[PDB]
């Protein structure tokens, strides 16, 4: 139904202008509105168009920032996202109003980041098995993916081979203003010494790749 | 303007689920939930704390008056463990809860605990360090405290858990020391200890550079 | 309520008309040397004529009020540097109270010319960082007009802020600082803007501040 | 006309303020008292030393005769750490009261301290400002010493203390030392001496 | 009827927010514009908007930059200009629409200055009367005033005494950016070696005052 | 969008004042007229061009149709020698003329001229501006030329003209160049010529 | 009526999805294509879709490389680029066909960037002036797309940029020089605003004669 | 397949111009021309050859047949001052010509050239980059050689050529000398030396 764009990141007292198009419900039979969630947060309501022309509502914490209109034509929502700041960073999604009550339908969600950080790619440490991270016959072994400040990393083992007892943890931003990430997968012990196991790291934003060895 | 409540709501796979949302002030209105799973929009549960959203199983049901309202489920699948969220409509705004995380029961499991030295790059680098791995552990009480030299450490660790993992059963847990690359080389020895329900003690693991 | 100007830096002898428009309804002005205390200086009653004046500006200072304009009026004349102080504008509640008070205007008598703010900041370096926390910042100095408005990266960084008044040098000019504490995690990593805003020199300096320590 | 007193009161959050206003004239009327925040205009507490302003809350109450006269503030909160005036009426002028000021009282700590070298366009222009920054302390008691090769400074520095905060309720300080860049080149080891409740032995913080 | 503000000296890229307040009118009744006046230009209509609110129009000139909005609780309009460019520098003035094709009401105006040149007060440079610049009975003396960010710049011969023959020139701008002005008299030639004149320079915005003394410095 | 012709109109007091608006666009609609003096904003004289507007004396009128208009005033008095401009509408879009200034008319005359070479202080400065002075001329159609050893100058010079003095109702102007220290001192001889209605021959004024 | 995105950089051997939504004319009552031009290239056609279903059409140096489909309910034009070489650098077009001969309407143009090189911002170094002209050169930011101007465009005239060239690093070099009064300097500075938009970077340089 | 001809074109604005479509290839079919300005994505100009496309003035007029055709522009305007391209479908695939672009003509005129040493910043990063500016030079033409202790260097520099600009049709070009910071320290004069048909001997400008 739903699908979004527009985001990215910004310089604080930047602008960044987001949208979402929808295929499916008539757009311009439905009231659309806009919903934020910082990370590690709950939801937020930002602001909403009422069903019909203007009628235009914001929430306390976003304005003299946060402009919006809807185009019935490109049967697509519009936020104006302007003098930004870092409270403002969050997953936006687009949503379809049941009435004046309820959000019947959401997008995907689109990320918007305000940070005087600039765009930095990976590097990546691994955390080896070695002698002293194996106990028996289970093994711990991983990476640690560390001083990106772009959240959407992705990471798999062994070229996306290996998912069994893999696990990797939420990105969490750092005091430096940039993000990390662990990522770890037990293994039997018996494999170590004749498996290598491949940490693959993707970081989109950056245009960064990096494959490591850990054993 | 509402509050949810229980913080943490943990079921069994088949028990009944009660989610709460209560008066901070009058807002008298029918208020609608939401779920939400991590990398994902939230979607609708009911059309009101009367009502259920098409698509939603009918196990879901919303209830309540005035400004005081439940959500209970008869009873919930592994796929219904999400975090659910309020919605009331106050003068023109739209308001969300904090909302009340619902996790999967199942027994208590000690954490396998791993300790993973700093690598040689972060050394070269200037930086360093250590990462306390605690895997397939149930419930997310864990209590991880690092120590260097056995001085009890605060405030230069990070702390990331994952979600009950269908596989592991369970949750992992990374618990990061940060260090310059001076304060791992002044000290010796690195441990930490970890608190947990299924363990008898606390267990230390440790490692000398 | 009480909206007032018409301050300003003149050379002692000379004069300045000063002026507040007001909503509602006896008015006065009240004034406060830096450091001071209130002073009243002259009212004026509801109606028409009927003002009081203190006896430390009879003779220099006349009060009236335009009943059309709904604008108080004070005029000063031959000022003293003794006569600097924040003019406050108030509204009078019977014959006890002052109910209302505009913001404040400063009016500033001195033989010095109007100077702009050179600003030279405080690098963090390296070895004044202790621990996670970092004190960086800028000296503003060398501006006659003591008011100096300073923030930081445009207004997006507010805590951990601090900002020391300003002080009078030997050479008649003053002197301010601004300096802030940060992670020092993020050094290296961000940078931070000081603003320097002089309206009365029309000065506008915008500082980068970096850990300017070891080549 | 009237004089109050103490000039600094020195109170917890929770705590039971009064102020007083001295006797110094045979004015008898009832006065009225008036609170200033830093940077702002002062606002009116109560229509006379027997009511209360419209809109304050129940807390503050004036109260006495003649002559002489108390403010109370049954409790304090944060929004009462101000200046407080007293104002009367004689014969047709409007009279305003030194005033005094109530700090909040808080545990003791010493500040952290930082220093400043001089910048190399500061250099450039010709002056040298060191400076030394305290922050984050309690009480302003701070004693602030510049050094220059182990030689006293005195009668070179500048000293700027900001107000209490609105969150921790501690001070800040800025000590600027001022050299000349000749005398910045003259010598080479700058420090700065701190001796603060808080700190135990002075605290001394250098650069080159 | 309009009393406006809110103008002085903004950076290049900067803004300011003008506004006016009107009186003797219901402002909801009536529509309005703003209108600005470089120096030695005519007028340009720079924005409105119709009485009640919405359906503002702007100037191509100022798009993108400038926002035009009132508020009917404040009997105020008011004018966001930003982006500020050089060529936005003039005298705004408010104005109340007749119907929708003439203005009947004028505010006073204000100023707005756009510059990157900071505030400096004026230098003065005596033009002698000499005995070159001088012409049977007449000689002209006088004082070039220069260098002066601001231009507001006021000039009085003899501290007011000399109120005739005095030809003071508007203020041009250099390319510097920095303004200058002429200020000359013309006396009897039989008043040099005499009569000493002084040239009184006074620039408020600067705290600046300058008494030369003109003299025939042939 | 519509031009005004005269681009200058002179007349003496009491004397018939006719002003012209016309076609660049065709855009047919009434326009308003209105007039400046030097310091004040524009002051509305017809409600349009088919009625007066109120207040102003019953010598003004407008008139015209379509895409063409004049202004007309019977019979001029000393206040209504000001700027006056002409107002139109496009659709949504307000516009102004250019506008044509009433000049006094008064007896043609030459400029008394001088030539002010630099100051000291002004070349110990590192400038050397030099002034040409015309003074009392009629009417303002002066044209002022710098030369440097008699070369023509041109793009380092400016021109300041006063408003007619409405008691002589001569002009003023003063014609500025501005060289360089360094300039100044390359060069050795500094003229300027003046060329007007009221003289024979362009005058000119020089020195070193 | 050609709304199109979806660029960015992209590794050797990765991939990208393109997209372009219709505004005006009915998506589904013609044929699509899209057409890229390398920098310091003329206009090479990649693909396109017929009106009705399938029909699809590839230029041969992108066979096996590219798929272009449409979504007739979403108004949207589509092409996935896989496999992508250096040689795919180019800002793609969307264009509307008129009937088999020409295409008459082009939508806005969209940057894609295949290279081994990550993301990276500028650094600026301003070129002091000592009419006299100043400005700032700004370098070493691989990404192609860098805006520079003066005064936040305020200072609009007089201005000169010069399109980024290469140096042997395989990052781009960039210069901006604006021509003012040479009586201006020691008066007035100039700020140089210069934004790197993919690798987030802003810098503000103060230009001083020197 | 077809290739275009002249490779360049220059035209004053009213004048008259063509850009020929020859034959490479045996094709037989009627084609369309497009425009594209720098910055911007193409536009039809003409349904194929017979045709113009909506919007576009009868100035512009496409004819020819079979394998090779001709674009005729009555008159150009500086709008039209763009490269052409022509289209054809062959077989089935969409095929694009190289395209040419039209000149905006204007007389000959040298540069006016700077050169801008390397800041503190440039040198302490371990780059010297220095840079040679020629400004508004036509035709596009110049020649930028440095020099370093008069020794010759080329292989060592980029230039940048900005399109003629709309106003005055002509060009700027920054020609920019990388050197190590090591580099810069061991040589002392840096010079640039610019040929120019404007000009009647290089013009060379410096700094050490």
């Known amino acids: 139904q739903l699908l979004e764009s527009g985001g990215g990141l910004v310089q604080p007292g930047g602008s960044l202008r987001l949208s979402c198009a929808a295929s499916g419900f008539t757009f311009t039979s439905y009231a659309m509105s806009w919903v934020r969630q910082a990370p590690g947060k709950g939801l937020e309501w930002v602001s909403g168009i009422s069903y019909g022309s203007g009628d235009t509502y914001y929430a306390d914490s976003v304005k003299g920032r946060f402009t919006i209109s809807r185009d019935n034509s490109k049967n697509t929502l519009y936020l104006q996202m302007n003098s930004l700041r870092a409270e403002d960073t969050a997953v936006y999604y687009c949503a379809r109003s049941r009435g004046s009550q309820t959000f019947d339908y959401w997008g995907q969600g689109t990320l918007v980041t305000v940070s005087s950080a600039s765009t930095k790619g990976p590097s990546v440490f691994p955390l080896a098995p070695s002698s002293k991270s194996t106990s028996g016959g289970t093994a711990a072994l991983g990476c640690l993916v560390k001083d990106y400040f772009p959240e959407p990393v992705t990471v798999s083992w062994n070229s996306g081979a290996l998912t069994s007892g893999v696990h990797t943890f939420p990105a969490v931003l750092q005091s430096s203003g940039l993000y990390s990430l662990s990522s770890v997968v037990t293994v039997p012990s018996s494999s170590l010494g004749t498996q290598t196991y491949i940490c693959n790291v993707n970081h989109k934003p950056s245009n960064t790749k990096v494959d490591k060895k850990v054993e | 303007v509402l509050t949810q409540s229980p913080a943490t709501l943990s079921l069994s796979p088949g028990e009944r689920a009660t989610l709460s949302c209560?008066?901070?002030?009058?807002?008298?209105?029918?208020?609608?939930?939401y779920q939400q799973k991590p990398g994902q929009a939230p979607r609708l549960?009911?059309?009101?704390?009367?009502?259920?959203?098409t698509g939603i199983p009918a196990r879901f049901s919303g209830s309540g008056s005035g400004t005081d309202f439940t959500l209970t489920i008869s009873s919930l699948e592994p796929e219904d463990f999400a975090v659910y969220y309020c919605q009331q409509r106050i003068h023109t705004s739209w308001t969300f809860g904090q909302g009340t995380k619902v996790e999967i029961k199942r027994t208590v499991a000690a954490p396998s605990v791993f300790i993973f030295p700093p690598s040689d790059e972060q050394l070269k680098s200037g930086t360093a360090s250590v990462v306390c791995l605690l895997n397939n552990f149930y419930p997310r009480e864990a209590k991880v405290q690092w120590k260097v030299d056995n001085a009890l450490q605060s405030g230069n660790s990070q702390e990331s858990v994952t979600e009950q993992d269908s596989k592991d059963s369970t949750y992992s847990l990374s618990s990061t020391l940060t260090l310059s690359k001076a304060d791992y080389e002044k000290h010796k020895v690195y441990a930490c200890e970890v608190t947990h329900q299924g363990l008898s003690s606390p267990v230390t693991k440790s490692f000398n550079r | 309520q009480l909206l007032e100007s018409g301050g300003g830096l003149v050379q002692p002898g000379g004069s300045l008309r000063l002026s507040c428009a007001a909503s509602g309804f006896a008015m006065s002005w009240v004034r406060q040397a830096p450091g001071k205390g209130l002073e009243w200086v002259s009212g004026i009653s509801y109606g028409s004529g009927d003002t009081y004046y203190a006896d430390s500006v009879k003779g220099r200072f006349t009060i009236s009020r335009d009943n059309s304009k709904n604008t108080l009026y004070l005029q000063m004349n031959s000022l003293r540097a003794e006569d600097t102080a924040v003019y406050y504008c108030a509204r009078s509640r019977g014959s006890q109270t002052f109910d209302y008070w505009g913001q404040g205007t400063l009016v500033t008598v001195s033989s010095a010319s109007t100077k702009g703010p050179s600003v030279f900041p405080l690098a963090p370096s390296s070895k004044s960082t202790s621990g996670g926390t970092a004190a960086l910042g800028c000296l503003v100095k060398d501006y006659f007009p003591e008011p100096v408005t300073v923030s930081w990266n445009s207004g997006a960084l507010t805590s951990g802020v601090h900002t020391f008044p300003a002080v009078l040098q030997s050479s008649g000019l003053y002197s301010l600082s601004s300096v802030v504490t940060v992670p020092s995690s993020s050094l290296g990593t961000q940078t931070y803007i000081c603003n320097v805003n002089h309206k009365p020199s029309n000065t506008k300096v915008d500082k980068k501040v970096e850990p300017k320590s070891e080549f | 006309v009237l004089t109050q007193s103490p000039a600094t009161l020195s109170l917890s959050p929770g705590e039971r303020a009064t102020l007083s206003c001295?006797?110094?004239?045979?004015?008898?009327?009832?006065?009225?008292?008036y609170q200033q925040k830093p940077g702002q205009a002062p606002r009116l507490?109560?229509?006379?030393?027997?009511?209360?302003?419209t809109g304050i809350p129940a807390r503050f109450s004036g109260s006495g005769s003649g002559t002489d006269f108390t403010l109370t503030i049954s409790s304090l909160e944060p929004e009462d750490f101000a200046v407080y005036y007293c104002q009367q009426r004689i014969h047709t002028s409007w009279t305003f009261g030194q005033g005094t000021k109530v700090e909040i009282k808080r545990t003791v700590a010493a500040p952290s301290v930082f220093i400043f070298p001089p910048s190399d366009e500061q250099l450039k222009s010709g002056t040298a400002s060191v400076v030394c920054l305290l922050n984050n302390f309690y009480p302003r008691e701070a004693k602030v010493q510049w050094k220059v090769d182990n030689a006293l400074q005195s009668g070179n520095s500048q000293e700027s203390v900001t107000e209490q905060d609105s969150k921790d309720s501690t001070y800040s300080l800025s000590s600027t030392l001022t050299l000349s860049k000749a005398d910045y080149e003259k010598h080479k080891v700058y420090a700065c001496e701190v001796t603060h409740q808080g700190l135990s032995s002075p605290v001394t913080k250098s650069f080159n | 009827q309009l009393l406006e503000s809110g103008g002085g000296l903004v950076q290049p890229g900067g803004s300011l927010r003008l506004s006016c307040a009107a009186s003797g009118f219901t402002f909801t009744s009536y529509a309005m514009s703003w209108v600005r006046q470089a120096p030695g230009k005519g007028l340009e209509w720079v924005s409105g908007i119709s009485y009640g609110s919405g359906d503002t129009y702007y100037a191509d000139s100022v798009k993108g930059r400038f926002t035009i909005s009132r508020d009917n609780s404040k009997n105020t309009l008011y004018l966001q200009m930003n982006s500020l460019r050089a060529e936005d520098t003039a005298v705004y003035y408010c104005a109340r629409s007749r119907g929708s094709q003439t203005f009947d009401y004028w505010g006073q105006g204000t100023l707005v200055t756009v510059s990157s040149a900071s505030t400096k007060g004026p230098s003065v440079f005596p033009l002698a009367p000499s005995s070159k610049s001088t012409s049977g009975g007449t000689a002209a003396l006088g004082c070039l005033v220069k260098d002066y960010f601001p231009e507001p710049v006021t000039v009085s011969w003899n501290s007011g005494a000399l109120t005739s023959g005095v030809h003071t020139f508007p203020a041009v701008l250099q390319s510097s950016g920095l303004y200058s002005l002429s200020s000359v008299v013309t006396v009897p030639s039989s008043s040099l070696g005499t009569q000493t004149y002084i040239c009184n320079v006074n620039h408020k915005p600067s705290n600046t005052k300058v008494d030369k003394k003109v003299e025939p410095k042939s | 969008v519509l031009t005004q012709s005269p681009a200058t109109l002179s007349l003496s007091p009491g004397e018939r004042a006719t002003l012209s608006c016309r076609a660049s666009?065709?855009?047919?609609?009434?326009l308003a007229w209105y007039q400046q003096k030097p310091g004040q904003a524009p002051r509305l004289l017809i409600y349009?061009?088919?009625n007066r507007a109120t207040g102003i004396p019953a010598r003004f009128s407008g008139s015209g149709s379509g895409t063409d208009f004049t202004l007309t005033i019977s019979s001029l008095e000393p206040e209504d020698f000001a700027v006056y401009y002409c107002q139109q509408r496009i659709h949504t879009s307000w516009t102004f003329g250019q506008g044509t200034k009433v000049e006094i008319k008064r007896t043609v005359a030459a400029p008394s001229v001088f030539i002010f070479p630099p100051s000291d202080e002004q070349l110990k400065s590192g400038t050397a501006s030099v002034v040409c002075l015309l003074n009392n001329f009629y009417p303002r159609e002066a044209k002022v030329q710098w030369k440097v050893d008699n070369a023509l100058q041109s793009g380092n010079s400016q021109e300041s003209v006063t408003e007619q003095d409405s008691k002589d109702s001569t002009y003023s102007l003063s014609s500025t160049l501005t060289l360089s220290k360094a300039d100044y001192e390359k060069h050795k001889v500094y003229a300027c010529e003046v060329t007007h209605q009221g003289l024979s021959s362009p005058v000119t004024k020089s020195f070193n | 009526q050609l709304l199109e995105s979806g660029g960015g950089l992209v590794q050797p051997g990765g991939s990208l999805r393109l997209s372009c939504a219709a505004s005006g004319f009915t998506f589904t009552s013609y044929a699509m294509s899209w057409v890229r031009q390398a920098p310091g290239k003329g206009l090479e056609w990649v693909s396109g879709i017929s009106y009705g279903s399938g029909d699809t059409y590839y230029a041969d140096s992108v066979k096996g490389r590219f798929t272009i489909s449409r979504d007739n309910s979403k108004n949207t034009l589509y092409l996935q680029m896989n496999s992508l070489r250096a040689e795919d650098t180019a800002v793609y077009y969307c264009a509307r066909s008129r009937g088999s001969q020409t295409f008459d309407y082009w939508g806005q143009g969209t940057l894609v960037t295949v290279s081994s090189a990550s993301t990276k911002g500028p650094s600026v170094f301003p070129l002091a002036p000592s009419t006299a002209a100043l400005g700032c050169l700004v370098k070493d930011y691989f990404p192609e797309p860098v805006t520079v101007s003066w005064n936040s465009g305020a200072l609009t005239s007089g201005v000169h940029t010069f399109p980024a060239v290469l140096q042997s690093s395989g990052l781009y070099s960039l210069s901006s020089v604006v021509t003012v009064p040479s009586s201006s300097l020691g008066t007035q500075t100039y700020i140089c605003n210069v934004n790197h938009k993919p690798s987030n970077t802003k810098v503000d340089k103060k230009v001083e004669p020197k | 397949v077809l290739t275009q001809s002249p490779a360049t074109l220059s035209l004053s604005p009213g004048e008259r111009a063509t850009l020929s479509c020859?034959?490479?290839?045996?094709?037989?079919?009627?084609?369309?021309?497009y425009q594209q300005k720098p910055g911007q994505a193409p536009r039809l100009?003409?349904?194929?050859?017979?045709?113009?496309?909506t919007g576009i003035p009868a100035r512009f007029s496409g004819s020819g047949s079979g394998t090779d055709f001709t674009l005729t522009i009555s008159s150009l305007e500086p709008e039209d001052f763009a490269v052409y391209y022509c289209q054809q479908r062959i077989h089935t695939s969409w095929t694009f010509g190289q395209g040419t672009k039209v000149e905006i003509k204007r007389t000959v005129a040298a540069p006016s050239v700077f050169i801008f040493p390397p800041s503190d910043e440039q040198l302490k990063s371990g780059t010297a980059s220095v840079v040679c500016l020629l400004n508004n030079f036509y035709p596009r033409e110049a020649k930028v050689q440095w020099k370093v202790d008069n020794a010759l260097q080329s292989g060592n520099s980029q230039e940048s050529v900005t399109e003629q600009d709309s106003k005055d049709s002509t060009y700027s070009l920054s020609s920019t000398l990388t050197l190590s910071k090591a580099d810069y320290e061991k040589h002392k004069v840096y010079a640039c030396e610019v040929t120019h048909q404007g000009l009647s001997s290089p013009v060379t400008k410096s700094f050490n």
């Open positions: 666009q065709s855009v047919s609609r009434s």
């Open positions: 349009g061009s088919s």
